[PDB]
From a paper:
The S. marcescens Rap proteins represent founder members of a new bacterial protein family, members of which represent immunity proteins for T6-secreted toxins, as exemplified by Rap1a and Rap2a. We have determined the structures of two members of this family, Rap1b and Rap2b, revealing a new protein fold. The Rap subunit is constructed around a helical bundle of five helices (α2–α6). The Rap proteins display an extensive dimerization interface, consistent with the observation that each Rap protein exists as a stable dimer in solution.
Well-ordered crystals of Rap1b and Rap2b were obtained and the structures were elucidated at 1.9 Å and 2.0 Å resolution respectively. The asymmetric unit of the Rap1b structure consists of a single subunit and crystallographic symmetry generates the dimer. An overlay of Rap1b and Rap2b subunits matches 71 Cα atoms with a r.m.s.d. of 1.4 Å. A disulphide linkage (Cys54–Cys120 in Rap1b, Cys41–Cys101 in Rap2b) tethers α2 and α5 together. By virtue of being longer than Rap2b, Rap1b has an extension of five residues at the N-terminus and 13 at the C-terminus, the latter of which form a short helix α7. These segments of Rap1b are on the surface of the molecules at opposite ends of the dimer. The Rap1b dimer uses almost 24% of the accessible surface area of a subunit in formation of the dimer. Surprisingly for proteins with such low pI values, the striking surface feature conserved in Rap1b and Rap2b structures is a crescent-shaped basic patch on either side of the dimer. However, the role of Rap1b and Rap2b is not yet known. While they do not appear to play a role in self-resistance, they may play a role in resistance towards closely related bacteria secreting similar toxins.
Residue numbers in the entry:
A (entry chain A), B (entry chain A): 24 to 107, 112 to 151
């Protein structure tokens, strides 16, 4: 009730990002898909969001898929030794998203300069 | 099988962030909690992750809770008019997370300098 109007360009905010950041958005979204119920609407939404990111960057799909997925696998299942009741899978995905490892990989998986944006390459 | 060892300080990566960024982590995590099934393990995990962020920043809880939540509400339910099958609730939360609006609010809700870090204030 009292819902806001539809979003006209859903990926406008992605198209303004440097490509290395788009890779991180894909990685985060897929991590979230993998740590939630594969047979649920949220997990499916996150998976499709991750996959859709590839349209907006010159991503190296053939090698990049498994390189990203192996890295996700190194973060997503960690047991969090919290100090002083959930497992913190969301926290694991955030740790991945901010990791130096993902930051390094995010630059390697982009054809050309990883600091360019989709808008730069397609709109102007 | 072949699982990696437990994480010793789960929030080490949060403690190194400028406080305004910690607010964004809270906002993203809670957005993810709200767009997933409230009666599911993932949603609960995301909620607890969001709530746990407050320990690591001088956050203005009394006003900040609803200010963050009103902003989440302006992003989370948007209908994405995709060009050329999920609703893209994950995308909505990412849009929130990168929004100028959240960036502005994230600085307003921190006592003192919002560019300081937990480590700066507590460890050295």
């Amino acid at each position: 009730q009292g819902h806001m109007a539809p979003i006209q360009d859903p990926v406008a905010f992605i198209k303004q990002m440097p490509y290395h950041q788009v890779v991180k958005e894909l990685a985060l979204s897929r991590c979230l898909a993998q740590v939630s119920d594969s047979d649920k609407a949220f997990s499916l939404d996150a998976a499709r969001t991750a996959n859709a990111m590839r349209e907006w960057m010159p991503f190296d799909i053939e090698s990049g898929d498994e390189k990203i997925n192996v890295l996700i696998d190194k973060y997503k299942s960690r047991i969090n030794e919290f100090h002083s009741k959930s497992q913190g899978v969301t926290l694991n995905c955030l740790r991945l998203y901010h990791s130096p490892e993902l930051d390094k990989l995010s630059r390697q998986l982009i054809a050309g300069n990883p600091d360019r944006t989709w808008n730069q390459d397609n709109a102007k």
